[PDB]
Amino acid sequence: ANLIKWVSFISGDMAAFGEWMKGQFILLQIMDWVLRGAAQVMFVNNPLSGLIIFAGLILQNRWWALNGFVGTVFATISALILCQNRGAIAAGLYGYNGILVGLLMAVFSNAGDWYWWLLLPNIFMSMACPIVSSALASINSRWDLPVFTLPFNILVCLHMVATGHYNQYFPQILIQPTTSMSNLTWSELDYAQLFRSIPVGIGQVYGCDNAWTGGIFMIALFISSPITFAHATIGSAVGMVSGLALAAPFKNIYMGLWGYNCVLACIAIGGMFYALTWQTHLLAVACAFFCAYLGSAIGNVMSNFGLPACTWPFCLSALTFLLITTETKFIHKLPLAKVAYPEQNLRYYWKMKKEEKT
Amino acid sequence: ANLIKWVSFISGDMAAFGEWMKGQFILLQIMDWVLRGAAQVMFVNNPLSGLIIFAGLILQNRWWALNGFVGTVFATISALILCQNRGAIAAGLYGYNGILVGLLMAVFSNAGDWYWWLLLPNIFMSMACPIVSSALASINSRWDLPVFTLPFNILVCLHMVATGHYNQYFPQILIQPTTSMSNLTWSELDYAQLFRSIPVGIGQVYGCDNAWTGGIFMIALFISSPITFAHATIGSAVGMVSGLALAAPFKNIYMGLWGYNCVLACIAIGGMFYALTWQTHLLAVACAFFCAYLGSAIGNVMSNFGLPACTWPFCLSALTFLLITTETKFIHKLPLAKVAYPEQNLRYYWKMKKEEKT
Amino acid sequence: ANLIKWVSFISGDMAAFGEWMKGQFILLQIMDWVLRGAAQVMFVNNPLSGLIIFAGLILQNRWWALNGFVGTVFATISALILCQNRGAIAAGLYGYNGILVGLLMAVFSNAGDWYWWLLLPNIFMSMACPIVSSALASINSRWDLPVFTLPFNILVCLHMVATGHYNQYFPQILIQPTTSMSNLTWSELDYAQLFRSIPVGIGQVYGCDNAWTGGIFMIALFISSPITFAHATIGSAVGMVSGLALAAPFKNIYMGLWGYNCVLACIAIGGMFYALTWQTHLLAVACAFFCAYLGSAIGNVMSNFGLPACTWPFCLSALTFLLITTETKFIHKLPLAKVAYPEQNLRYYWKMKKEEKT
């Protein structure tokens, strides 16, 4: 029983911890919001999971973790100075874009490790994450649709294309479009790495190509909500099978470059923003297949500009599947105000169902 | 008199045939909806015209016709399983995207004829045509604007860029941007082919560069509605004159690559979605000129990605001309619920006019 | 006192001159609207300032000035024939897109000076400026957001990409993406030109890289409204400092290629569409930094297509900063119907404030 209580306390949103947090020093609240935003990249509103995510990021590369921390803290500060909202900043909804911006600006920088000047764009871009997010909200809230990772996409694409591979101050890695045909010898497929694509794929959401970091992220997801963990591994599996189907190079599948978009899409559609149902689960799997496929599409499109498909496919596929109108009630699109971790969304669906029956 | 009755029965939407169809077996209804969606690519809601279109497609290339049939039937099935709507699936509004996807995925595939594996994306993309269409509806219905061929554009562009010219499984033709200056010797203009551009242009809507297929399509349009036929030939004529004006290569004009967007735009604006009036006809001609011009623009833009301007210019130009606000009542934008073949739209306009006068 | 009265008469919108203009011949009204639209490129609704702008344009290059005049007059005529509106055409809101289209189609044409055929697209594009503008209004008016220079962007990009550098009739200059790394020797910085970037930057809004033309434009802005002049020079300064920060080539900063977007953004956000406040001024400076930064981004993105970032960054940044929702009342987004020169906007803000207090 002590265990049940404790698990209840560490699982979900940790609402009790949030209400306790609403009282202490503003700096400790900022730390809680930073951790919560770090965790919200995978649709998790949990501080302990955020600490676990930061442990994984530190495990992979310290410099990337430092940039991510700077990005999330300055995105939260910018949300505060712009008086965006409390309960959105407090829930970490203004921090995940910042941590992603920091991490993926560190990842794609050709300058090297511990290029301190890289903090200056990271300070800037993170502080622009709320602004753009608010803007997109004013467009998306008309359809009750989430902003998703759109600010990150827009801002990191701006950074990597305005800077490019050839600027003297903030170089980026060289991304070139495919020019020669690559032969895939199916006899050279390594099933060990092919199945490591699931942990690496779930870890690549945050820029990490390490299997252990992916396992740490899965542990965080499981502590938060098992439904998110299941949909995450299913999304990475559909991403790796879709990559196999579209003649993608095996190294890309091994490095999880075909999974992060799919894990995000499967988490979002399957439970997070649609009420969980077998119809909704099938819709989530279909959206994850579409997300991998459109991920290949966007990667090939944006390789011409020297950019990568960072999360664009997730945003596009999730919004497309979240906009569809259906004449069956079993595909229920939850209102944004009533969106929380998928288990609580399912409990809400049940309450609505019973009440309607009566 | 027997002839008048008969022509009435084969002309327009064949509403009597639709009400009779609402009774028979679901498979025969699926066949009717497949034919109707095949015909609706040129804004025609007619089953007999759809059979004529399939005859033309079989005349040009059997493999392309088979892919188009598979695409339209699976798009209709996907619309059914998603419970999209009846009267939209029954009117063929969920099938034209599928048939276009199949036809133009067959057309741009470098694998060859009777590459059976090509059906697998065609099965997938067609089944994704309703989803995307519904999504775009939720955005477009806010302005009472039609989805048009947007899902086709989005999905076939995704296919041709995610696959590309260099993948091992689903190769695409090589589309490269212009690099050297091409001299146009006006003395080498062939007026016979230059005027064959009209039938070939109207036939290119469906991917066919055959003059006879274009003539068959014109026959189908004439059986459906003469106004659509007139606006179709006018659109192809303005496309070929615009291509002459913009120094386009003569071979492109001969192959009808400058007409399909313009025929679609002229059909849509002139009568189909605007009440037919001399002001509306002039607006349709202007929109068709803009459609050819923006067709050159989109072709040059998307040649960098290795993609073609499939119907994007039609959608963009038609939506732009359908969004304009005007202080004169003679340019009347019909509500979507009251949209049918242009003659019935004109009869509705008259009823509204008389009623308003009284 | 005679001076006060006179300055009042030449400053602002010249409302007295407008009411007097509402009476005379239609041709003289067309001339007034042409001048007013020429002036409105920098958010100035003043005829005398428009005459000053045309004097500057004639000073730089006669052919460009002639194309700009043709574009603005034909855009006004097209707005009239489409029955768009009076008070929008009369305020010049349908002419600035036309004059910009003419000027920048002259600027980027490789055909040469006095290529009379260039008028034919200029006639066409200008007449398409109202249509597209109306279309974008129907989308933008849902959020109470201005169209801005969007039609210009869309239409001149269509022209320069459909024509390209390699067409026989309407050649364009060659814009290639960066391929080799350029070293910036900070010891070669010329502070004289570096500070001339402000006049040249403010003059580049209209395509002019001449310092004297920029000074003439600043004189026009000062006669219209000092707040616009201050925000204009501040925007050009932030553009030139941002260009220095992002390792831009010094020649681009000298030619003012980093200022026009920023001057437009700073004018728009700081006073023109937001009520002027120190918070709004800081938001305008931030938006101008974002505008320069996204200007580099769009230039690098669209260099692949052979296009330049004409005003796109201004439109994107201004709309993004005009869409943000804030919980503080000090950032006030004025309704479009109540938008005029920034001093009158500030007077309106004060009236609203006092009335609310009581």
**What is the C-alpha separation between B94 and B149, in angstroms, rounded?**
10
* B168 and B195 part of one domain: no
Do A240 and A296 lie in a common domain?
yes
Amino acid (1-letter code) at residue B103: L
Cα C289 to Cα C295: distance, rounded to the nearest angstrom: 10
Residues of chain B contacting residue C85, judged by C-beta atoms under 8 Å apart: 327
C-alpha dist (Å) from residue A14 to A10, A31, A45, B131: 6, 15, 8, 36
- In a shared domain, residues C98 and C197: no
Q: Are A217 and A203 within 8 A, CB to CB?
A: yes
Q: How far apart are CA C105 and CA C246, in angstroms?
A: 28
What's chain A look like in SS3? CHHHHHHHHHCCCCHHHHHHHCCCCHHHHHHHHHHHHHHHHHCCCCHHHHHHHHHHHHHHCHHHHHHHHHHHHHHHHHHHHCCCCCCCCCCCCCCHHHHHHHHHHHHCECCCCCCHHHHHHHHHHHHHHHHHHHHHHHHHHHHCCCCCCHHHHHHHHHHHHHHCCCCCCCCECCCCCCCCCCCCCHHHCCHHHHHHHHHHHHHHHHCCCCHHHHHHHHHHHHHHCHHHHHHHHHHHHHHHHHHHHCCCCHHHHHCCCCCHHHHHHHHHHECCCECCCHHHHHHHHHHHHHHHHHHHHHHHHHCCCCCCCCCHHHHHHHHHHHHCCCCCCCCCECCHHHCCCHHHHHHHHHHHHHHHHC
Rounded to the nearest angstrom, the minimum Cα separation between B286 and chain C is: 9
Q: Are residues C154 and C218 in the same domain?
A: no
Mutate to test the interface with B, among C78, C147, C166 (most CBs of B within 10 A): C166
Q: Do A131 and C324 touch (CB under 8 A)?
A: yes
Strand runs labelled E in chain B:
none
> C322 with C224, same domain?
yes
Whether A198 and A343 map to the same domain: the answer is yes
Q: How far is C296 from chain A (nearest CA, A)?
A: 5
Q: What would the two tokens of residue C307 be?
A: 């296009």
Q: What is the DSSP letter of C187?
A: G
Give yes or no for a contact between A308 and A175, defined as CB atoms under 8 angstroms apart: yes
Contact A293, B158 (CB under 8 A): yes
Count CB atoms within 10 A of the CB of residue C357: 6
- The residues of A whose Cβ lies within 8 A of any Cβ of B are 142-143, 178-184, 245-247, 286, 289-290, 293-294, 296-297, 300-301, 304, 319-321, 323-328
CA A253 to chain centre: 18
Pairs of residues, one from chain A and one from chain C, whose beta carbons lie less than 8 Å apart: 74
Please list the residues that pair with C274 across neighbouring strands.
Answer: C270, C333
Q: Report d(CA B315, CA B313) in Å as an integer.
A: 5
CB atoms within 10 A of CB B277: 18
- Taking the C-alpha atoms of residue B26 and residue B30, their distance in angstroms, rounded to an integer, is 6
The reply to whether residue B162 touches residue A297, judged by beta carbons under 8 angstroms, is yes
Q: Which of B83, B128, B304 sits opposite A328 (nearest CB)?
A: B83
Q: Which residue has the tokens 């192809």?
A: B236
CB contact under 8 A, B181 and C166: yes
Q: Are C218 and C199 contacting, i.e. CB atoms less than 8 angstroms apart?
A: yes
Does A131 lie in the same domain as A79? yes
Tokens of B352: 């509204």
Residue at C89 is within a domain: yes
Of C134, C125, C120, C112, nearest to C159 by C-alpha is: C125
**Residue that is last in its domain, among A173, A199, A220:** A173
Does residue C134 sit in the same domain as residue C223? Answer: no
Domain membership flag for residue B1: no
Whole-number Cα distances in Å, C214 to A233, A321, B179, C220: 59, 50, 36, 10
| Residue B156: inside a domain | yes
Dist. CA C155–CA A180, nearest whole Å: 36
CA distance A245 to chain B (A): 8
CB B256 within 8 A of CB B250: no
In this complex, the residue of C143, C181, C286 whose CB is nearest that of residue A166 is C181
* A184 part of a folded domain: no
CA distance C65 to C206: 10
Question: How is residue C219 written in tokens?
Answer: 């004189």
**Measured between alpha carbons, how far is C320 from A16 in angstroms, rounded to an integer?**
36
Give C-chain residues touching B142 at CB under 8 angstroms.
142
Contact by Cβ (8 Å): A67, A103:
yes
Helices (runs of H) and strands (runs of E) counted in chain C:
16, 0
The answer to whether the CB atoms of B168 and A179 lie below 8 A apart is no
For the four alpha carbons of B16, B19, B22 and B24, in that order, the dihedral sign comes to negative
CA angle A171, A172, A174 (to 5 degrees): 125
Tokens of residue B240, six digits: 């070929």
Q: How far apart are CA A258 and CA A244, in angstroms?
A: 10
- Tell me which chain B residues have a C-beta less than 8 angstroms from the C-beta of C131: 286, 290, 320-321, 324
Let me know whether A135 and A254 are in one domain: no
The last residue of one of the domains, among A118, A145, A173, is: A173
Distance CA A136, CA A158 (A): 16
Alpha helix segments (H runs only) across B146-277 = 150-163, 191-203, 211-224, 226-245, 250-254, 260-269
- Residue C133 CA to residue C141 CA, distance in Å, equals 11
Give one DSSP letter per residue of C116-129, joined into a string.
GGGHHHHHHHHHHH
Is C176 inside a domain boundary? no
In chain B, the residue whose alpha carbon lies closest to the alpha carbon of A294 is: B158
The CA distance from C86 to the nearest CA of chain B, in Å, is 10
The first and second tokens of residue C63, run together, are 């052919």
Residue ending a domain, among A173, A208, A240, is A173
Roughly what angle, to the nearest 10 degrees, separates helices A47-60 and A211-224? 180
Which residue among B179, B183, B304 places its CB closest to the CB of C305? B304
Residue C261 lies in a domain: yes
Taking the C-alpha atoms of residue A111 and residue A163, their distance in angstroms, rounded to an integer, is: 12
Q: How many CA atoms lie within 13 A of A19 on its CB side?
A: 3
Q: If DSSP codes are grouped into helix, strand and coil, which group holds residue B333?
A: strand
d(CA C15, CA B314): 43
Same domain, C97 and C130: yes
Give the position of tokens 């034209």: B96
Of A180, A297, A326, the CB nearest to B82: A326
Task: Enumerate the residues of chain C whose CB falls inside 8 A of the CB of residue B301.
Answer: 161, 305
- Clarify whether residues C228 and C158 are in a common domain: no
Residues of chain C contacting A, Cβ within 8 Å: 142-143, 178-184, 245-247, 286, 289-290, 293-294, 296-297, 300-301, 304, 319-321, 323-328
**B254 is in which domain, residue-wise?**
190-358
Query: How far is Cα B74 from Cα B95, in angstroms, rounded to an integer?
Result: 8
Query: Which method resolved this structure?
Result: cryo-EM
| Contact assignment for A138 to C179 by CB distance below 8 Å | no
Rounded to an integer, what distance in angstroms lies between the CA atom of residue C229 and that of residue C237? 12
Closest CA to A137 of A72, A84, A73: A84
The structural domain count of chain A equals: 2
Give the whole-angstrom CA distance, residue C328 versus residue C332.
9
B·C CB contacts under 8 A: 75
* CB distance B311 to B262 below 8 Å: no
Q: Using N-to-C axis directions, what is the helix angle for C62-81 and C47-60, rounded to 10°? A: 140
- Whether B206 maps to a domain, the answer reads yes
Closest CA to A42 of A29, A57, A27: A57
Of C245, C294, C328, which has the smallest distance from its Cβ to A83's Cβ? C328
DSSP C96: H
Tokens encoding B151: 């899902």
Is residue A101 assigned to a domain?
Answer: yes
- Backbone φ and ψ for A120, nearest 5 degrees, come out as -60, -50
The DSSP call for residue B271 is T
Which residues in C lie closer than 8 A to residue B290 (C-beta atoms)? 128, 131
Residues B65 and B119 in one domain: yes
Q: What's the CATH code of the domain at A200?
A: 1.10.3430.10
Cβ contact, residue pair B170, A247, below 8 Å: yes
